[PDB]
Amino acid sequence: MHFEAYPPEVNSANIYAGPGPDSMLAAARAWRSLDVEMTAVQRSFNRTLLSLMDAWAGPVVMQLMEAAKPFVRWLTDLCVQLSEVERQIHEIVRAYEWAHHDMVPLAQIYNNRAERQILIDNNALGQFTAQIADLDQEYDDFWDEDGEVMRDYRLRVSDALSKLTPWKAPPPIA
Amino acid sequence: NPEALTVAATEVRRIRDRAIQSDAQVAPMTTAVRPPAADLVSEKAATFLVEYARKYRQTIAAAAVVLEEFAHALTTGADKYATAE
Amino acid sequence: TDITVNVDGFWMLQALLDIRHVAPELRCRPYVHPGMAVMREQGIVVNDAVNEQVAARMKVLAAPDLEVVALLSRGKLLYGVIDDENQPPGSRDIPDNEFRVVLARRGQHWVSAVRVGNDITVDDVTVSDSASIAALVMDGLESIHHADPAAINAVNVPMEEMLEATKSWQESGFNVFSGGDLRRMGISAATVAALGQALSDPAAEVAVYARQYRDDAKGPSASVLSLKDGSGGRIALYQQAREAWLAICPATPQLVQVGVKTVLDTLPYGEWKTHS
């Protein structure tokens, strides 16, 4: 995505509009809880298997532990993925906050445009023409700045998502 | 020991309830993610997180099937060694 | 020798050569496949690299020591404004009636970029002194519209007072019957008539100005050379090198070269033939 395809009125307005990160912050809390509860589940599952082994030692239960091994491992991998989700959501919220902060405010763009129109309104004798071009260079600098702010935002979000790997289906037991 | 298998089945279903319950409790929060702004980066993030929550829910449903069948197996195991005395 | 690309094709050259901005008068997009295979057939991109000669030219525009700019128009020059409601924000379009010419030099290498319509044309150009620059401009202007120098005498008026007076005069359509404030500053009856025509209903306009780059800064020419063709003559407005004074002049070949020299002598960092 090349957001320099678009003028700064577009990139700046788009980042300032919308509801904010509250709903991402709430989801992060929710993912934390799951991490907590599923770790407890894992820990309870290990204890259940071990106390079954302690209560009835011998070949039948050992074969039961063997047939549970894939699911025990899967459960461990699940918990490791769970503990990464909160982190990365907060990394994304930060990325959004820095994009919001670093983007050029609209007022600054509108002022550039309004100033430029006043010079033109008064340019019968042509003596503001170079100042008019300085303002166009300034506008182009806003376009450039927003372009690179959106580039860095894309790359931060992209890196964060790349660390949230896909859920694998649990293996069976017996 | 037959009784040990029965005890384990109960504990495995209790663990299943907990997995099912935690999934459900927070599902409204994981799936309600909105883009924080109107840009396409924000939207790609929110859309990913919603889909990621949905796939996590399929996954726990699958793991609750796997646990229930374990519990059923332990029970049926216990009724064989108890009905052999 | 010369090359002609549109605004998107120009953006590809920017990407291929990692050039961020060029002159804002060219109205391209900053830089932060099927369109390629067109420039391969025209020999601009050999293998997957920009031709050595064309790369060089584009690098002049990428970082000039000097830009000398000419905005030309057929009819009233609009300074890039298109009146159309559905025009998008930061449109790269230019009005149908405008030709933009940027003359850039890096070291001793003078390059030209001319934007007309959606087409930017790039080529080497021969520039030595203010005369040759005046020539290039007059050639460009004559091509749009032929006119003779107005029948008036050169006069110098205070810049501030002339702007204030020209702003009232504008409110009445630059009518010669409302030219009394300009008459009282000692401007000729003939000049006031010719200037009123040039401002109220021009057949062609030209603004010439320049920009100079030093280490960590830039700066525009303090003066702008402006030419206008109305009923009864081409006239030349430009600021003297200093508050300020506007020269109002018949657009003779001589006074036009004087005006270009004044533009160039009002750059902030001095000598412009040799600067770096």
XYZ file of C-alpha atoms in Angstrom:
535
model
C 0.000 0.000 0.000
C 1.428 3.414 -1.063
C -0.520 6.029 0.873
C 1.493 8.735 -0.952
C -0.970 7.918 -3.759
C -3.353 10.076 -1.715
C -3.224 13.771 -0.679
C -2.671 14.800 2.947
C -6.343 15.837 3.399
C -7.127 12.118 2.966
C -4.372 10.586 5.109
C -4.798 13.160 7.923
C -8.645 13.036 8.025
C -8.686 9.232 7.930
C -6.413 8.936 11.007
C -8.287 11.607 13.018
C -11.739 10.120 12.307
C -13.144 6.953 13.893
C -13.840 5.728 17.429
C -10.327 5.324 18.849
C -8.586 2.354 20.413
C -10.974 1.611 23.346
C -12.434 -1.431 21.681
C -8.945 -2.824 20.986
C -7.968 -2.189 24.625
C -11.044 -4.078 25.804
C -10.279 -7.009 23.513
C -6.717 -7.093 24.942
C -8.161 -7.473 28.467
C -10.390 -10.242 27.168
C -7.456 -12.102 25.577
C -5.521 -11.755 28.889
C -8.350 -13.559 30.709
C -8.314 -16.376 28.201
C -4.566 -16.713 28.620
C -5.121 -16.953 32.391
C -8.045 -19.394 32.236
C -6.454 -21.657 29.615
C -3.205 -21.875 31.601
C -5.304 -23.049 34.587
C -6.993 -25.594 32.244
C -3.603 -26.849 31.115
C -2.385 -27.099 34.716
C -5.554 -28.908 35.802
C -5.252 -31.285 32.860
C -1.657 -32.217 33.796
C -2.697 -32.838 37.420
C -5.644 -34.996 36.343
C -3.430 -37.153 34.161
C -0.721 -37.433 36.866
C -3.111 -38.354 39.638
C -4.708 -41.003 37.414
C -1.239 -42.397 36.928
C -0.519 -42.303 40.670
C -3.883 -43.961 41.485
C -3.487 -46.796 38.944
C 0.134 -47.410 37.934
C 0.712 -49.987 35.141
C 0.552 -50.580 31.321
C -3.070 -49.489 30.659
C -2.654 -45.973 32.070
C 0.820 -45.528 30.554
C -0.744 -46.204 27.116
C -3.428 -43.646 28.042
C -0.734 -41.043 28.844
C 0.925 -41.874 25.496
C -2.310 -41.313 23.578
C -2.777 -37.943 25.386
C 0.732 -36.657 24.584
C -0.220 -34.932 21.288
C -3.120 -33.088 22.965
C -0.971 -32.096 25.971
C 1.584 -30.586 23.562
C -1.088 -28.891 21.550
C -2.495 -27.413 24.742
C 0.962 -26.063 25.663
C 1.322 -24.445 22.221
C -2.133 -22.951 22.539
C -1.223 -21.284 25.844
C 1.986 -19.839 24.332
C -0.052 -18.313 21.452
C -2.627 -16.996 23.926
C 0.016 -15.056 25.869
C 1.141 -13.188 22.722
C -2.222 -11.707 21.744
C -2.518 -9.032 24.466
C 1.069 -7.902 23.729
C 0.518 -7.445 20.046
C -2.809 -5.646 20.413
C -1.075 -3.123 22.659
C 1.741 -2.845 20.079
C -0.929 -2.036 17.475
C -2.639 0.564 19.721
C 0.721 2.245 20.229
C 1.311 2.172 16.476
C -2.050 3.872 15.994
C -1.304 6.466 18.676
C 2.004 7.394 17.042
C 0.455 7.601 13.584
C -2.299 9.894 15.046
C 0.371 11.985 16.738
C 2.842 12.208 13.842
C 0.271 12.931 11.106
C -0.119 16.553 9.963
C -3.179 18.201 11.538
C -5.946 19.273 9.121
C -5.924 22.896 10.274
C -2.339 23.138 9.019
C -3.319 21.883 5.582
C -6.417 24.069 5.328
C -4.331 27.134 6.378
C -1.817 26.415 3.687
C -4.615 26.246 1.139
C -6.405 29.324 2.515
C -3.162 31.378 2.567
C -2.438 30.350 -0.984
C -5.894 31.493 -2.150
C -5.393 34.931 -0.561
C -2.104 35.432 -2.379
C -3.806 34.492 -5.668
C -6.709 36.823 -5.001
C -4.029 39.572 -4.662
C -1.667 38.517 -7.495
C -2.742 40.892 -10.294
C 0.784 42.225 -10.599
C 2.315 38.753 -10.211
C 4.660 39.557 -7.283
C 3.354 36.818 -4.959
C 3.942 34.057 -7.492
C 7.092 32.681 -5.868
C 5.435 32.742 -2.458
C 2.546 30.863 -3.999
C 5.031 28.180 -5.159
C 6.663 27.979 -1.671
C 3.196 27.168 -0.301
C 2.777 24.453 -2.921
C 6.106 22.989 -1.833
C 4.906 23.101 1.780
C 1.690 21.276 0.801
C 3.780 18.639 -0.995
C 5.842 18.295 2.199
C 2.601 17.570 4.126
C 1.763 14.897 1.452
C 5.225 13.379 1.878
C 5.087 13.449 5.699
C 1.689 11.711 5.862
C 2.971 9.198 3.340
C 5.830 8.188 5.549
C 3.738 8.242 8.685
C 1.318 5.789 7.050
C 4.244 3.684 5.775
C 5.611 3.313 9.351
C 2.122 2.593 10.682
C 1.610 -0.144 8.087
C 4.955 -1.724 8.935
C 4.371 -1.672 12.701
C 0.918 -3.249 12.384
C 2.259 -5.717 9.877
C 5.068 -6.834 12.208
C 2.664 -7.191 15.091
C 0.183 -9.374 13.128
C 3.011 -11.549 11.782
C 3.684 -12.628 15.392
C 0.048 -13.853 15.830
C 0.315 -17.272 14.110
C -2.776 -19.296 13.158
C -4.701 -21.503 15.540
C -4.026 -25.232 14.859
C -6.812 -27.766 15.428
C -6.435 -30.021 18.467
C -5.366 -33.650 17.816
C -7.580 -36.452 19.141
C -6.852 -38.694 22.131
C -8.802 -41.994 21.723
C -8.475 -49.270 39.973
C -11.792 -48.707 38.155
C -12.858 -45.779 40.364
C -9.782 -43.808 39.249
C -11.022 -43.708 35.643
C -14.463 -42.517 36.809
C -12.845 -39.765 38.910
C -10.766 -38.661 35.924
C -13.796 -38.510 33.588
C -15.520 -36.165 36.041
C -12.418 -33.960 36.276
C -11.975 -33.922 32.500
C -15.596 -32.744 31.993
C -15.075 -30.111 34.687
C -12.006 -28.881 32.752
C -14.097 -28.922 29.559
C -16.770 -26.705 31.200
C -14.075 -24.228 32.158
C -12.668 -24.034 28.642
C -16.195 -23.620 27.209
C -17.157 -21.043 29.833
C -14.097 -18.795 29.395
C -14.491 -18.788 25.624
C -18.119 -17.660 25.920
C -17.633 -15.137 28.698
C -15.260 -12.941 26.648
C -16.362 -13.654 23.040
C -18.377 -10.456 22.858
C -15.237 -8.459 23.635
C -12.835 -10.249 21.255
C -15.215 -10.079 18.324
C -16.334 -6.443 18.843
C -13.022 -4.933 17.665
C -13.507 -1.835 15.541
C -10.847 -0.003 13.532
C -9.577 2.920 15.669
C -9.647 5.171 12.611
C -10.907 5.184 8.986
C -7.612 4.310 7.302
C -6.872 0.975 5.698
C -4.120 -0.023 8.198
C -6.541 0.323 11.104
C -9.131 -1.693 9.260
C -6.730 -4.504 8.313
C -5.795 -4.782 12.014
C -9.364 -4.814 13.339
C -10.497 -7.254 10.662
C -7.573 -9.621 11.479
C -8.361 -9.563 15.230
C -12.023 -10.341 14.667
C -11.235 -13.237 12.345
C -8.536 -14.415 14.809
C -11.059 -14.451 17.641
C -13.520 -16.400 15.445
C -10.892 -19.056 14.593
C -9.930 -19.309 18.230
C -13.608 -20.104 18.992
C -13.759 -22.896 16.404
C -10.577 -24.217 17.996
C -11.963 -24.415 21.552
C -15.185 -26.002 20.281
C -13.000 -28.652 18.617
C -10.970 -29.118 21.815
C -14.242 -29.560 23.783
C -15.277 -32.338 21.412
C -11.842 -33.936 21.945
C -12.230 -33.681 25.744
C -15.781 -35.042 25.848
C -14.688 -38.108 23.839
C -11.831 -38.594 26.308
C -14.289 -38.490 29.200
C -16.596 -40.932 27.399
C -13.634 -43.267 26.817
C -12.581 -43.139 30.479
C -16.181 -43.910 31.566
C -16.564 -46.826 29.144
C -13.128 -47.970 30.326
C -14.318 -47.890 33.957
C -17.546 -49.866 33.223
C -15.468 -52.668 31.615
C -13.058 -53.198 34.533
C -15.942 -52.750 37.037
C -18.129 -55.244 35.101
C -15.304 -57.813 35.282
C -15.234 -58.742 38.991
C 17.440 13.533 -27.062
C 14.110 14.668 -25.489
C 11.727 12.495 -23.441
C 7.977 12.752 -22.798
C 6.182 11.031 -19.970
C 2.867 11.513 -18.171
C 2.453 12.093 -14.422
C 2.361 8.356 -13.552
C 5.276 7.535 -15.845
C 7.153 10.353 -14.142
C 6.391 8.725 -10.760
C 7.930 5.464 -11.934
C 11.155 7.236 -12.842
C 11.080 8.653 -9.307
C 10.723 5.124 -7.878
C 13.353 3.685 -10.236
C 15.887 6.395 -9.277
C 14.788 6.976 -5.647
C 13.962 10.670 -6.031
C 11.560 12.135 -3.486
C 10.387 15.559 -4.741
C 10.973 17.670 -7.843
C 9.846 21.260 -8.551
C 6.324 21.781 -7.307
C 5.402 23.472 -10.600
C 5.577 20.101 -12.306
C 2.791 18.903 -9.936
C 3.942 15.342 -9.517
C 3.338 13.000 -6.535
C 6.036 12.549 -3.926
C 7.745 9.147 -3.731
C 8.200 7.568 -0.261
C 4.335 -3.943 -14.634
C 2.485 -2.576 -17.772
C 3.432 1.136 -17.576
C 7.097 0.031 -17.621
C 6.962 -1.944 -20.898
C 5.915 1.363 -22.543
C 9.160 3.119 -21.491
C 11.138 0.046 -22.680
C 9.778 0.504 -26.237
C 10.833 4.182 -26.109
C 14.332 3.265 -24.833
C 14.003 5.110 -21.521
C 14.446 1.981 -19.415
C 17.103 -0.375 -20.807
C 17.120 -3.809 -19.186
C 15.470 -2.702 -15.910
C 17.441 0.518 -15.361
C 16.848 4.078 -16.532
C 18.997 5.081 -19.537
C 22.259 6.746 -18.365
C 21.537 10.055 -20.145
C 17.984 10.328 -18.825
C 18.996 9.278 -15.274
C 21.482 12.163 -15.277
C 18.760 14.674 -16.319
C 16.301 13.509 -13.675
C 19.039 13.814 -10.978
C 19.382 17.525 -11.866
C 15.674 17.992 -11.116
C 16.058 15.834 -7.990
C 18.604 18.231 -6.484
C 19.253 21.424 -8.413
C 21.452 24.254 -7.281
C 19.001 26.510 -9.101
C 15.512 26.423 -10.532
C 14.333 29.169 -12.883
C 10.579 28.929 -13.468
C 8.175 30.291 -16.124
C 4.351 30.043 -15.812
C 2.743 30.722 -19.234
C -0.963 31.111 -20.067
C -3.372 31.614 -22.942
C -5.807 34.166 -21.560
C -5.681 34.989 -17.870
C -3.013 33.027 -15.987
C -4.726 31.203 -13.088
C -1.628 30.093 -11.121
C -2.738 26.476 -11.143
C -6.374 26.887 -10.027
C -8.975 24.823 -11.826
C -12.589 25.784 -11.087
C -14.459 22.508 -10.934
C -16.343 21.225 -7.923
C -15.502 17.524 -8.396
C -11.765 18.305 -8.578
C -10.203 16.038 -5.949
C -7.987 17.235 -3.091
C -4.377 17.950 -4.094
C -5.250 17.323 -7.742
C -2.230 16.917 -9.978
C -4.144 18.359 -12.938
C -3.211 21.799 -14.286
C -5.582 24.143 -16.062
C -6.121 23.482 -19.793
C -4.636 26.941 -20.572
C -1.263 26.615 -18.772
C 2.277 25.599 -19.804
C 4.828 25.283 -16.961
C 8.562 25.445 -17.698
C 11.213 24.633 -15.067
C 14.848 25.196 -16.057
C 17.060 23.429 -13.516
C 20.837 23.358 -13.181
C 23.126 21.172 -11.097
C 26.763 22.221 -11.483
C 27.069 23.172 -15.176
C 24.265 20.894 -16.407
C 21.063 22.727 -17.460
C 17.932 20.615 -17.819
C 14.404 21.640 -18.791
C 11.084 20.221 -17.615
C 7.979 21.418 -19.418
C 4.548 20.402 -18.195
C 1.557 20.798 -20.562
C -1.698 18.898 -20.000
C -0.809 15.665 -18.235
C 2.512 15.441 -20.143
C 5.961 16.288 -18.690
C 8.750 16.604 -21.239
C 12.400 16.347 -20.140
C 15.494 17.341 -22.141
C 18.870 19.100 -22.021
C 18.764 22.875 -22.563
C 21.284 25.576 -23.502
C 21.487 28.433 -20.984
C 24.318 30.919 -20.472
C 23.170 34.411 -19.359
C 19.923 36.285 -18.651
C 19.557 37.019 -22.390
C 19.315 33.338 -23.354
C 16.799 32.803 -20.521
C 14.742 35.812 -21.662
C 14.880 34.365 -25.194
C 13.542 30.929 -24.134
C 10.677 32.637 -22.304
C 9.779 35.022 -25.164
C 9.907 32.133 -27.668
C 7.528 30.210 -25.392
C 5.178 33.189 -25.020
C 5.200 34.209 -28.712
C 4.167 30.609 -29.481
C 0.895 31.198 -27.586
C 0.231 34.729 -28.725
C 1.985 37.424 -30.755
C 1.958 41.017 -29.531
C 4.076 44.176 -29.716
C 5.456 46.187 -26.780
C 2.941 48.690 -25.455
C 3.495 52.334 -26.411
C 4.563 53.521 -22.953
C 7.586 54.799 -21.005
C 9.250 52.875 -18.168
C 8.273 54.183 -14.727
C 9.138 53.147 -11.153
C 6.417 53.234 -8.488
C 6.438 52.230 -4.806
C 5.407 48.597 -4.480
C 3.232 48.916 -1.385
C 1.232 51.900 -2.750
C 0.771 50.303 -6.182
C -0.680 47.089 -4.621
C -3.107 48.984 -2.448
C -4.161 51.049 -5.508
C -4.320 48.060 -7.832
C -6.537 46.255 -5.300
C -9.191 49.027 -5.360
C -8.878 49.287 -9.116
C -9.588 45.536 -9.417
C -12.963 46.078 -7.663
C -14.159 48.159 -10.631
C -12.888 45.712 -13.295
C -9.675 47.734 -13.817
C -11.738 50.319 -15.561
C -9.744 53.223 -17.031
C -12.428 55.662 -15.868
C -11.516 54.506 -12.272
C -7.759 54.816 -12.889
C -7.389 58.091 -11.009
C -5.454 56.739 -8.005
C -2.857 55.273 -10.370
C -2.828 58.550 -12.329
C -2.080 60.515 -9.096
C 1.018 58.374 -8.361
C 2.329 59.811 -11.640
C 1.685 56.830 -13.882
C 0.946 57.861 -17.524
C -2.541 58.011 -18.971
C -1.181 55.639 -21.690
C 0.296 53.214 -19.127
C -2.894 53.186 -17.106
C -4.878 52.401 -20.286
C -2.528 49.613 -21.433
C -2.159 48.083 -17.945
C -5.938 48.153 -17.369
C -6.385 46.148 -20.591
C -3.628 43.718 -19.693
C -5.169 43.143 -16.235
C -8.892 43.145 -17.230
C -8.736 40.986 -20.371
C -5.346 39.420 -21.172
C -4.656 37.216 -24.186
C -1.520 35.704 -22.632
C 0.441 36.031 -19.367
C 3.854 34.955 -18.119
C 5.312 34.844 -14.590
C 9.105 34.266 -14.299
C 10.850 33.607 -10.968
C 13.626 31.494 -9.469
C 14.847 29.442 -6.534
C 18.356 28.813 -5.134
C 19.556 25.985 -2.836
C 22.331 26.115 -0.161
C 23.509 23.331 2.221
C 20.616 23.217 4.751
C 18.162 25.775 3.193
C 16.392 27.263 0.109
C 15.074 30.670 -1.007
C 12.904 32.243 -3.735
C 13.740 35.301 -5.803
C 12.451 38.428 -4.043
C 11.272 39.725 -7.457
C 8.963 38.248 -10.086
C 8.986 39.146 -13.771
C 5.415 39.321 -15.072
C 4.378 39.804 -18.713
C 0.854 40.491 -19.961
C -0.675 40.877 -23.467
C -3.805 43.062 -23.712
C -5.353 45.388 -26.312
C -2.579 47.767 -27.317
C 0.488 46.035 -26.093
C 2.581 43.659 -24.061
C 3.690 45.118 -20.741
C 6.366 43.972 -18.233
C 6.030 44.234 -14.455
C 8.979 43.475 -12.206
C 10.441 44.475 -8.921
C 13.673 46.448 -8.752
C 16.508 44.963 -6.578
C 16.531 46.715 -3.181
C 10.917 49.585 0.758
C 10.359 48.191 -2.796
C 9.790 49.563 -6.298
C 7.782 48.032 -9.157
C 9.004 48.760 -12.675
C 6.158 49.092 -15.172
C 7.624 48.798 -18.646
C 6.991 48.300 -22.268
C 7.894 44.644 -22.921
C 10.748 45.493 -25.285
C 13.385 42.800 -25.905
C 15.842 44.852 -23.821
C 13.713 45.623 -20.766
C 12.577 41.969 -20.698
C 16.224 40.878 -20.419
C 16.761 43.539 -17.692
C 13.804 42.095 -15.769
C 15.137 38.547 -15.932
C 18.510 39.847 -14.685
C 16.727 41.526 -11.764
C 14.886 38.320 -10.882
C 18.209 36.466 -10.850
C 20.000 39.236 -8.942
C 17.282 39.051 -6.170
C 18.130 35.476 -5.154
C 19.184 35.290 -1.495
C 22.676 33.702 -1.855
C 24.252 35.777 -4.709
C 25.986 34.514 -7.891
C 23.714 32.188 -9.866
C 25.798 31.032 -12.853
C 28.344 29.260 -10.646
C 26.632 28.541 -7.262
C 26.574 25.191 -5.441
